[PDB]
């Protein structure tokens, strides 16, 4: 699909770096519910707080 800022290529031929990779925004809440459950079980909320 047309994009004015991105281009598709092969990973092995490009040898891209982290900043060469393109960025997008992903919706958290579906993941955040499961994360809340897992962290409430495992007993490490500081990490959840930072990530949230």
């Amino acid at each position: 699909p047309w994009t004015t800022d991105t281009t598709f290529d092969d990973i092995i031929l490009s040898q891209p770096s982290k900043e060469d990779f393109a960025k997008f925004t992903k919706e958290a809440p579906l993941f955040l519910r499961f994360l809340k459950l897992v962290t409430d079980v495992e007993g490490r909320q500081e990490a959840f707080i930072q990530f949230a």
Binding site: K36, D40, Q45, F48, A52
Partner: protein
């Protein structure tokens, strides 16, 4: 004059501290995440 001043005072205080409580409720969970049950 008595009920007048009393009710005026009560209304003014109610409005002022309603605004202040709204602001504090907005800015609570950020500065105190250990209480937010969203993260618990």
């Amino acid at each position: 004059s008595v009920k007048f001043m009393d009710q005026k005072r009560s209304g003014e205080e109610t409005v002022y501290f309603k605004k202040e409580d709204e602001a504090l409720l907005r800015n609570l969970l950020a500065n105190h995440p250990e209480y937010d049950p969203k993260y618990s």
